């Protein structure tokens, strides 16, 4: 029923968790393959959790509940890229050069 | 007309004048239409106006619609054009195309004075400088204490001055003067008095007696002990004259920060 | 009535969720602003973040159960499956508080490296919200043990399945960013 | 009694303070008085402090932000006095320790007590009743949301008679605002005021969020919503998406002081330039959220006195949702000279400019509703054609120092200060006056005076040129913001027009206080009796005047935009119901009065560092919070024989009135 929606978003997430644990605690012989497989894992784990515990759907508010998900994540992803953005050229400059 | 910004003196200043003219200018093709109409239409179609035509049930044309949107438009477009050529030509930190060694000031901002220090003449003065005219000015600015502004409007640009941060601007005078500097941040009690001058000599011979009077004072500045001594905080600083200098303080007054 | 407060509650988490991408961006900047003292390698023990990860995604599939055990009419269940949920988020910020501990007393509190000061603002800030919802889940307890499952018990213990979902979906955000990145 | 309050904190032997802080005592006596005097202390309860309906809400959100624009009046006043007298070489009144506080105490109040309380107070008193609710979709929440303002302006106020408040500057940029440049309680104040008063108006914007999309009438789509409920809508997304911002960042700045982290500090690791992104990140869209609101109320008043449909809807309503995407993206033009790159300011510069774009399209699409209409010279119409001038000058003044190159000249200078007086007075305050004068039928029953409302107009409207036009100029003369001592004699005369300049805005002001007088004064001369003084388009005015505090014995059906319109001109609207059921109503609460009385405790124990008190008032907080949890008389429900009474004494007011 909609315990077997609980029950794989879990076993899921218990694989999702494993996996960039265990990449960084071994070695793995790569940091590049390392860092992309864990934000990749980190996004596909969050992406359980919305579908799974918070029910994300299409169609709960008449089309909200869901564009005011997305519409936040733009504002993050602004906000975030945006000030990592801004900090990093007025951290190049006021230097000594 | 005559007013430090409308009237500058040196080549930054002068192009920010054409730039700050030129953007006026494409807005107001815009923005005066738009009070005329505000006053215009205001006055023709009045309620005790029996002769204009009522329409109230008129709201929506597609060709006012697309002039409404367009010419707004166009004027941004021709505006970021400018924008972007602009920031990449008036940017401090990018030094100006002169082929005349510029003379580099560094610049500490105290509590609540202007600390100047002149690296290649082992000079070091507190609300004063001087350069000559027609040479560029290499600034490296610095903070000892909360952040201030380093401005000298009738020259050009401003920078923000960081303790443990070196912000770099970059200046030139067209014509011999002095030119009253001030801090353009808020820093404290003192900020008022945070004005120094800034004197454009005729030539280097009037600038090299500069530094040759500022060379005959008794005071050093050969420890950051005596810079700890000037850095306790004061107001309204006269303009004072060090002789010696340490030969690399400008970066220690930074790295009291970053270490 | 029931999901306009259920709604509301999305939209309270929406601004939550950009409360904490603020703690996130000071962190990405600060986090190389050690001041001779310890970096993310020196400090984290990824043994003990995943004990901590594991926890808050065992309270995430008992939460799931009390709520399915609500739209059951089992007032019994509800309360059994809350009292797992509270036993491993009481768990989870018994470890944040036990990491804090060392920290401070090892001389690498808040107030050493402000490296130091954006790692205790936002894995600090995110234990005050599991503590928060570990004061409302035990308060929403003894109303349902008191009331049953009423109409209004039945909307709390959905805007609480909200925040504590998104707790764990926060935590997933903050042992990527900290914790594994830092210890590569 | 404990932690840093030791009776040398309250400022004795400065006699400018101790005289404003007796006519607050003696002002709050005298106020305090006259309610035991008339017996009106259980009607204050239990009527007005205690309720839950947005009509009382909202006007008392506009009595805070109309007291406390007096306050911010007249220190600004104080201001223009201290710079006039500074050049021409005396060193008269205000000493900097005194005079740095005043515009940090100018900025937060006008910001945050004065505009904040306006827009939110209008938009709560009109927003339900154009959507054909009965009320707000979280009345609890809305009148907690209005005594966590309440807290604000107690918390700036006895900084006034206790410490002292900060001196930084309204934003509190770091290490000036650190814990070793300020070591006093100013900047303590400024923190606690913000972060209690910051939280109120999150849930204010969460509030009127789901309000507008889940509580509209049957048949109301969104575009054929009012665009005054378009511009609420976008209004109130962007505090949902910033005033976030506001908490971490004080909070960020609450943890260096108190706890001594390193976030913004100049030494170990700490990076100040972090805070300056952050509280801008905050600082353009709250510049946003005053001015949308706004532009709701000039197209409504612009649509009703000019007789004629609001032209361009669709356009005037994507211009709206342009303008609450693009405020994110546009902050860094607050701080075009710390050092960023060429491109990184080109950027943000080409989009600052890019959000002037949907502001022309709003502002050529009032002019074109008035383009063949039967203007009708109202007192509320004049704020509009005076905005359409003003704003126009301001918000070209603007776009002007989004150019980066023209802005390493005219940053922090007197340019940038008459900008933004010229957005806020010219916008913003225009369109809080224009609502108050719109919708004071509504909320009273009762009309304003015409004449005295003209004459407000024509001391606020070039009154204010007189007062900032000389910062025009004196921005490209070379003085800069926040000049106390000593100034230049070159910028005296210019300071001096400045000077009387404001005091034509203190004749707006005082003819404010003359209209209200004398319309209260002749409220039974000029009672609104239909409902619809003017010739209303939207639902506001289907109403009674004041509205029967369920706001609609029935919710209307909506079919078309300009609902109250079409249904008057197809003879509808004044139509009596065969039969009526009963209508379930929140009940007032005593709480969210005893959260806040918690919370300015936890803020006043926070500030001076007693620690036994901060527990106490913040463990009220949450055991009010958990107590009202348990409660269960909420609501109940209006009978029919209520409401019955109700409107038959409307309806025979429509039929004695010719209708
Ligand atoms: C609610 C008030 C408000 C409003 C409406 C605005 C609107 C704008 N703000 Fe002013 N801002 C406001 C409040 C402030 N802004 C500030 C600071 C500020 C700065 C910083 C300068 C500096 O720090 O040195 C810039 C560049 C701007 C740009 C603008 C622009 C481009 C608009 C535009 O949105 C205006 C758009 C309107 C226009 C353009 C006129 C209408 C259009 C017409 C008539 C036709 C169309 C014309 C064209 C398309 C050209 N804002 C500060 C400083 C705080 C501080 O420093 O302490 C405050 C309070
Ligand atoms: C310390 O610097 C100073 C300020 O900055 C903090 C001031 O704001 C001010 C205030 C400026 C004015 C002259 C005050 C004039 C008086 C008026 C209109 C204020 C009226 C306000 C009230 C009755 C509301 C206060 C009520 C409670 C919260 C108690 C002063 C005097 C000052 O010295
Ligand atoms: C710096 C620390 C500050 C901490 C302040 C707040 C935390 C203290 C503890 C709070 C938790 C106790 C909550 C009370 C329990 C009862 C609540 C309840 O049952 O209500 C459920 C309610 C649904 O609404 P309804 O059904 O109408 O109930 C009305 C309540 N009067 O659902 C609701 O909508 C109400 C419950 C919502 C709870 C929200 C959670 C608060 C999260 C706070 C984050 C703290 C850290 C912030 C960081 C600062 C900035 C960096
Ligand atoms: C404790 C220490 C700290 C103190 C800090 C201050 C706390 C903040 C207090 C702010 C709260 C706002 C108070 C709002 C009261 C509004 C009362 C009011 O307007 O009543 C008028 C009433 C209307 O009569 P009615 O015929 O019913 O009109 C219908 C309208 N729908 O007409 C009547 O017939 C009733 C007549 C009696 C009303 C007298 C009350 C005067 C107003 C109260 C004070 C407002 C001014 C000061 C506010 C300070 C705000 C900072
Ligand atoms: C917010 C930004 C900053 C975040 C950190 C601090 C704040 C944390 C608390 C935020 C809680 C937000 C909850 C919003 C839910 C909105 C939707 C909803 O479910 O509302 C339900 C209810 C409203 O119900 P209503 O219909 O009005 O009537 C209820 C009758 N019992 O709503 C309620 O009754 C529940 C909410 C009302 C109670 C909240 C008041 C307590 C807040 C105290 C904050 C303490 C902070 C101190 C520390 C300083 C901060 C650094
Ligand atoms: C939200 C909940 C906040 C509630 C906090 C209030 C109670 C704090 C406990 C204080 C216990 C104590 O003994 O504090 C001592 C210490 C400073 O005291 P001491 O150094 O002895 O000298 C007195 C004044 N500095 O105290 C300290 O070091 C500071 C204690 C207060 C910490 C500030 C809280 C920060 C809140 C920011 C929101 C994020
Ligand atoms: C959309 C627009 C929103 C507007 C928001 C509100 C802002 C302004 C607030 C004032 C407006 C409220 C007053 C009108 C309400 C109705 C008054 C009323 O019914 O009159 C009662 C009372 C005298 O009447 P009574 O003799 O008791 O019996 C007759 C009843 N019909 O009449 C009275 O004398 C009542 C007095 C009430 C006024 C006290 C409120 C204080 C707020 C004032 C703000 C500051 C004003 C500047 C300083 C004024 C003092 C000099
Ligand atoms: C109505 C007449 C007003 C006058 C005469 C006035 C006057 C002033 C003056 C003289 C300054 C300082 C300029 C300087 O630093 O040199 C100032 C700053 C400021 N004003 Fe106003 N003001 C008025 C209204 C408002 C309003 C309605 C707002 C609403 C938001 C406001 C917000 C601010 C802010 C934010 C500052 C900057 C604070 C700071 O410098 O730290 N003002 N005002
Ligand atoms: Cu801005």
Redesign the pocket.
Known sequence: GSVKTYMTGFILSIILTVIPFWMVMTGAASPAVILGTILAMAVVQVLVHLVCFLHMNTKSDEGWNMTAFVFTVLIIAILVVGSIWIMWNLNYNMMMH | CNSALLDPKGQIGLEQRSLILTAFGLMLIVVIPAILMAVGFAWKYRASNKDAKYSPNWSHSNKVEAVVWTVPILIIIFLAVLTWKTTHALEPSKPLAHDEKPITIEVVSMDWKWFFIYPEQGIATVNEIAFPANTPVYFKVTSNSVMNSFFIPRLGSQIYAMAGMQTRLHLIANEPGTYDGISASYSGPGFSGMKFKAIATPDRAAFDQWVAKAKQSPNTMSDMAAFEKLAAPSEYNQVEYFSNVKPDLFADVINKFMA | AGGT?IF??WI?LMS?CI?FS??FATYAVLVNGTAGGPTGKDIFELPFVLVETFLLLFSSITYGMAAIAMYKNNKSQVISWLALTWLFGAGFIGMEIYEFHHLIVNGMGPDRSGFLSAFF?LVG?HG??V???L??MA??MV?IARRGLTS?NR??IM??SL?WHFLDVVWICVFTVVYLMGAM | MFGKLSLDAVPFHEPIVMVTIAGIILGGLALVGLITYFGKWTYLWKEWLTSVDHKRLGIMYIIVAIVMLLRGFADAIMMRSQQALASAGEAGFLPPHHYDQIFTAHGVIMIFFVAMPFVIGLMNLVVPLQIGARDVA?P?LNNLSFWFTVVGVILVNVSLGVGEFAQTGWLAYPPLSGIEYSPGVGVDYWIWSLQLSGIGTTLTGINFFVTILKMRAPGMTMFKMPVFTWASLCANVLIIASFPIL??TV??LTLDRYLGTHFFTNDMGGNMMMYINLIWAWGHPEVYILILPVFGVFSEIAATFSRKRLFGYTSLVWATVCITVLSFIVWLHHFFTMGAGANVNAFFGITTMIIAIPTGVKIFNWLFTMYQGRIVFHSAMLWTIGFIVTFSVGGMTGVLLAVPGADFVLHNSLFLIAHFHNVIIGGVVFGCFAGMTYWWPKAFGFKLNETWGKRAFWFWIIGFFVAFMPLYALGFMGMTRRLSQQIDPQFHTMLMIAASGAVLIALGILCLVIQMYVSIRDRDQNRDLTGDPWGGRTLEWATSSPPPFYNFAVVPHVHERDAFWEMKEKGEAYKKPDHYEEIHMPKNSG?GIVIAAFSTIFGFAMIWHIWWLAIVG?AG??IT??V??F?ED?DYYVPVAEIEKLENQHFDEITKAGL
């Open positions: 407060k509301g509650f309270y939550d409360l603020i703690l603002a800030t005050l919200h503590t928060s919802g004061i409302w308060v929403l109303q209004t909307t709390r805007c609480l925040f | 979280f609890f908490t971490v909070a960020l709480a913040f907080m949450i919070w958990i009202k949890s409660d909420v």
